């Protein structure tokens, strides 16, 4: 959707492999960012409960994903997750109800 | 699409799917189109793009059409895969 989002941050603990989510790039016509597509049940994110589907990932441990294109942003995200090889600070953008 | 050999391997899970997209194709078969990074298939490392899916936990596809085969695959979701992979 092309609506209004606010920024939220929370810390997600690890080491229960990873966050336990799938993310997808979004594009339109002529792009939009990286978004949570699904949350794997039993995953770190699932246990923690705060991350939601359709949240846009904005930053990971201080590493912004803005300004980048979906390709670069995805890269930056994977890079920032290779922490081990136990806590991720997420900044997300979530649509206002 | 050249000459293919049949390979079989077991892919572990846990939760999430196999983590691949598959595409059909006169009707040929189901082929791995992409392997989603971080997914079970990616972690396992043996499945490759353009592998033809031949069987899943002993359920053959082949005889079927792309539509039916795709169905059978979804239905059938540790997975025993049989693939056909080009040598030539």
């Amino acid at each position: 959707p092309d609506g209004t989002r606010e920024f939220l941050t929370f810390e997600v603990p690890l080491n229960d492999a990873g966050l336990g989510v799938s993310v997808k790039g979004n594009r339109s016509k002529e792009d939009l960012g990286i978004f949570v597509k699904s949350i794997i049940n039993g995953g770190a994110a699932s246990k923690d409960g705060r991350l939601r589907v359709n949240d846009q990932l904005i930053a990971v441990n201080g590493e912004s994903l803005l300004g980048k294109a979906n390709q670069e942003a995805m890269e930056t995200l994977r890079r920032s997750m290779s922490t081990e090889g136990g806590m991720i600070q997420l900044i997300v953008a979530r649509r206002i109800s | 699409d050249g000459t293919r050999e049949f390979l079989t391997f077991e892919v572990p899970l846990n939760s999430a799917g196999l983590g691949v997209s598959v595409k059909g194709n006169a009707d040929l078969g189901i082929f791995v189109k992409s392997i989603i990074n971080g997914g079970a298939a990616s972690k396992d490392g043996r499945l490759r793009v353009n592998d033809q899916l031949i069987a899943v936990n002993g359920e053959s596809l082949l005889g079927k059409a792309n539509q039916e085969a795709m169905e059978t695959l979804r239905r059938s979701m540790m997975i025993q895969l049989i693939v056909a992979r080009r040598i030539s």
Binding site: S22 | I36, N37
Partner: peptide, 7 residues
Amino acid sequence: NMEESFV
């Protein structure tokens, strides 16, 4: 065409 990942 698509763009997807697991983290």
